[PDB]
């Protein structure tokens, strides 16, 4: 009984309350008002998709993010992020494979990856799970929290996804 | 039947938009892509004047909202248009199909002077085929892998009447 | 009937105006663009508000019933002609106001804004409409060969005038 | 009638403007933009509110009752004229409103705006006015002839005048 | 004549279509915006430049002089109807290139633009000009009265037109 | 004389119009707006170029010097009337070309325009201009009493008027 | 004389910008206040057609920018406004003052039909006081720190003439 | 009369603005805007509210009954001069109220917004109003000469000022 | 021949596009926009130009003349399928250059766009084009009944389509 | 033959290389284009007022700056910035009393004060000979060059200032 | 039992009412005004802005007590300028030192600014030992700096860093 | 004697012919293109972004050698990707390696970027190995991920820190 439906105006408020260096469409902000603008200016763009989960009750549950859309290699980079309040409910498993299944069966994307901290071999476990692989352990790619960290980056393939039970 | 046509107006967006979050594909509004509501009403908005597609909803004698009828691609030089036929999910079975093609038909070779009225439908859906084929349509192409659906590109058939046949 | 009158239109009058359209299966425009929707007519509305190329006047009775419309297109005031379009809701007709309604639109035209020609089409197919509009002195002027598209065939219509001198002296 | 208040037109007042207009048979003009719809008066309202050129004074009794309007229009600031219009309610006509009414308008173009000439139209099919704004101090300097369509025919109207002197005399 | 071509309105066109109103002493039009100078007739078309309810084509010769223009007005979509005029330019009159030019606009009303109804008006008091339609396959369908104030006086104008099956029919 | 020609006022025009009232001594308007500066009539000429309720023409030699302007300003299409004026620079004046040009001006309201009335107004104290307006065939209706402030005093002037139907009947 | 009055245009503004960096005082354009040509430039553009205020450049035959005529504060009721010349120094002590006061007078009272003229002058310069007199202005006020001038407040004189006492 | 209290002019007020010029028999401004309509008047306050070239206050009763305004206009910050001007609602005049407003209005002038000079113009046919100035310590500096067309004809009005210096006292 | 190039489309081609149409016959579009002038196309090209859903290239030879278009429309990046036209310039036509250019237009949309799908529209009374196409190994895939008023006439098309798989080979 | 005149639009060039935290009517900026926007939305406001100083060649000398207006007590903060290449030319006294007699023969104000780094002596005594005087020791007002730094405030009234020979 | 809470757009009347006193000329983010109308304009132009920080003192019953601003709050030098004002009713109950320090306490250990400096009149030189018992020091004696009450009039600046208000 | 300059608007035709040769799509700022004109707009608008930083690379002569871009510079993390493009004429002179070095002495001295890195394909073991050589190291062998030349293709990520630059 969770959905995914396509983001509005009105979810901003819950996407900038999930955040506190925050993007929207490679443009930084920090306020509200500037995210307001952002949203305003690119809401036409396709190169970024983004998702609201809710419950049957219209709870918002969390965010499926595709961004770095490339229409000619058919790839993009999936992020999820489950409000606080909403974890450890085993509601990510559910998710991530609605996020494949618009991905693959609905935008006809070929690739999708994505980043998740070595230091959360939890989180790395899981999209093992859902069907992604690593293909690289980036050597202190970001600096969060104080020091430089190595990432995964970990990929599915549309053939993989779809044949799954083939 | 008591089943009414009347021009989209913004107000039903709402109903527009929920027809499509039940569906497959992608969808587009005067051949742009949306997927949420606002987008949805943007492109209204843009659009609002502009011939090239002409749409109607259905209603019944309690104004239930039953169903879309669409013209897309209308080109008013070679006078053809492509029409498609959405019916909300709770009326489906209702044998609500054949009056709306019906409908559709005499709108645009009644009212707006086409000559030609195509469609495409799923050729895994051969019940859908059958239906067009007794409202008159006749296949014209067997369109190979036109279009990605549901995770795997499929077949559709191309059908089309024109203005003298259904008018006879 | 001397109690029905004619007023300007106003935007609390374009849902009758669009109402009108409904029954009458034609393609219905405002000051030459083609609408179909409510909020296609409203943005035409505040569009052309103060354009006098065109004007309408909304008839209502005595309590008020919207009973239809008398229509002024392609007003030139050089040429100082007008084509002249009535619409008497369904509900309305057969009552005898058509004879004082196309009366008060020549008044307006020929006493107040001082035309001196108004002419209408009207479909060869009715010849009882045509008759009507001969008894009010609109005398047939062209015959037009399948000058419309109208319920799935084209249609001859005639063309039809009164000239302000005439109307005057009658 | 001493008790007959003008005051400035208000947003309020459109209504009744339009009202008086819908009596007449003739085409009405707002800062010389023809209207027939109360919406189009509104928007000519709205954009000329500011603007000098025309100023409107509705005629209220001790009860509020709307009994007419005073009008000057084409007011020019150099030469110091302006044309002057009465309307009275149909209810309220034949109270003998009307000599009171031009001599207010009278006041106020002369005392208080310091313009030097006012002018205005009355038909010479209505010889009744045309005698009743000679009482007023008014004297034809014109017969304008077919200047109006009216009514299904051209008719020549009487242009009549004041000057500020001399109605500022009328009084001594 | 043969070597006559028919190629769409530019902006430098305008120039031409501009002198060609200059001799007529009618009033010019543009999408049914009337124009009397240059300056009016330049934003017109600036503001009308994709609005496919009229097409023009100017006439040109090997040369490139410019002979004339074909106008298609009051195009209708649904009717599938136009009004067509033609100006040959005075020094142009007289060497047998009306016919041709009439011609080149059906053609591409009724083969290219797929229209069904070609109409024009044409002055009672021109019957040289009658004819020459009729012998084009044209035919009256009205005798309008008075219904152009042209030169001092109304004057009436036949309507005259022709169908799609007919002009495809002449030539089988 | 004969090759005098009218032709529609353009951007070109408005330095000509701006010298020409810098003789004068009177106020200029531009469609009832007052201007002094030729900045001030750039942007009124901007504003109401497709604005029909004035009309202008520029008066040329075969050598395209510029002779003089014709007005016509509170063209009403209703009453089908308009003021005229006609100035003609200073240099142009005393060569008999106003009663060629008053004709004209005259022409082109009745035959064209199919205006019903033109009227003019003209300073009592320039009787000349009375009488060439009366040989026009222009008749006073009206001496107006103090109606314009000039060169310190204010002036009377005659209103002079034709008809179309007089004008079309010479 | 061979000097003429215009009326002010854009392309005069850098001229009434230069008259001014010579001055004492802050300068004024329909009452605001400017330093620099892009503000100068900002309130032409807002006041083009404001009739509060008018202004005349004065050039001499060979277009020479001679000096500026202002009538500021008109009022259309009373029928008055404040006149101020200024006079570029190129062109002082050549005895031009007189007619452009004139010039001035002759446009408010047979064009502009003013009824009275006013203007402020330093008491500190009774050579101008006396030049005014001439011209027929009388003094109405004796204005007592009217203004900050030079580092400190000044009288000024008021000094009007009515359009009957010029126009015999 | 020690119970009179001055406050900032407000939206809400406007009606007593208006409601002020309406006996007055004079042309009325905002801002250097004229105005005859309350809606024309509206407008003005909307696109003026925080323009500093005037400033307006209500005068008040204990009981909040609206007894007149203090309007200082033409505020110059460079010379430090002001018109000011005082209207009393009809109900309230001859209660002796003008001489207090009027040393409030200058109060505020001199010490809080430190002007250096407030002038006023009063019709030389009330010299009633001229000699009361001329208590408040207002001095004429020009009988300004058919200045004004009030009432049918030019009339002349003296200018009468005070300073800031003359105002403040002193130990 | 091999000495033919692509590249794209640029301003200052807009006058040969132009001049392509002008034998043609029909009625030209530009990003589904109609137009028959210059200054129509010229402002319809200012406000596409970065617009994918259409994509043209230029056909040079070794000299630099003009031989012809080779024209992407209706590219969907979603079904991945495009259609394809070619317009070889009156002079250049019988040279066999179409069968290279053809060739060339699949390459690019095959192996640089990553495109499933190219199709065409045809004339049926255009055989000796159907059968070119054939060779170049499309396939009918409809026979569109009077799809298109061209020349006074409804004529029918065939649509004819070839797929990414089968025109990239293979070891 | 300096010459005081208002900045204009095409003097933003050089305000911009006389700077490398900047600010317009309290704004922050560091770019040309936000110096330029800023420009245009207060080319009116009155809180600020500056002068470009030129020589006889229209070199462009430096900037004085009066900002901080306060029109109810009728004071100013001053900054004068010269170009690295016209230094030590002997100009800061000049151009110091040119801003000075602006102020108090032109503005009409009361009072006009600055402030200068305690580590800058030099300037100290340069403003006290053109008759400012020390009203405050501000410590550690500013975070300059990695350290916070101490500066006097010092100031100068429109009386003493224009009764100077008297 | 005195609150400190950020100041809310239902607390402007009380902010106004607090002038109506005060015989000097308000300013909102350095912007002027006299009426309700003009400071609600202002408060709506400069919500988000941070350049100035309001908190209204309310006690255990809700009473409105009074305000502590911070104002030209800077985030390079880290400093900012305080005032308090104490409704005159509340005023003589000693809860100016209780204010001051709640304004320091926030100023110090949560903005975690360097300096914190106010304006006193020198007339007042009871206001001034009291803020020097609150460890404030002179470190300005700005001569004539505001017209205030019909003559200009010198104040002391007055700071304290933090390091010193920590230890 | 090479000399890396910074690209100007007259460098741009370089950059498009650059890309006539290559059978990928370009990008300009992650924006597509394929005309001049489209790069043109797309240099217009993006003159004063950051995020990519290009140099155009001369000989003694001021002949066009190629290009250096960093791309997807971030100055958060420090890091950006870099390529070099050697125009056909100059391959084969041992200009990669120098380039390379200048690259990453203009990163890591200059930019102060912590990580540099590159895409490379697998089916390039050559440019691989040299990029080994410069010393840079595999971080991640990236299946499919780009459309090249008509066939999905592995690219190797490979970059270099910095601190090991430096030393």
């Known amino acids: 009984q969770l959905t995914l439906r396509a ?3 009105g979810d ?3 996407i900038h309350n999930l955040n506190n260096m925050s993007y929207w469409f490679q443009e930084p902000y920090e306020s509200f008002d500037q995210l307001e603008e952002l949203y305003n200016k690119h809401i036409h763009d396709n190169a970024e ?14 965010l499926v993010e595709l961004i770095e859309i490339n229409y000619i290699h058919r790839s993009a980079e999936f992020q999820i992020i489950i409000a606080p309040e909403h974890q450890g ?5 559910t998710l991530i494979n609605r996020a494949l299944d618009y991905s693959f069966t609905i935008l006809n994307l070929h690739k999708i990856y994505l980043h998740v901290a070595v230091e959360n071999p939890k989180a ?3 999209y093992e799970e859902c069907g992604f692989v690593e293909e690289g352990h980036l050597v202190e790619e970001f600096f969060i929290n104080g020091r430089y960290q190595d990432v995964k980056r970990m990929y599915i393939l549309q053939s993989k996804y779809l044949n799954r039970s083939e």
Chains 1, 10 share one sequence.
């Open 7 to 9: 983001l509005e105006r």
């Open 124 to 126: 790395v476990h899981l």
């Open 89 to 93: 409910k085993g509601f990510a498993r």
């Open 49 to 62: 998709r983004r998702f609201v989960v809710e419950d049957a009750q219209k709870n918002l549950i969390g």
């Open 12 to 14: 901003l408020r819950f």
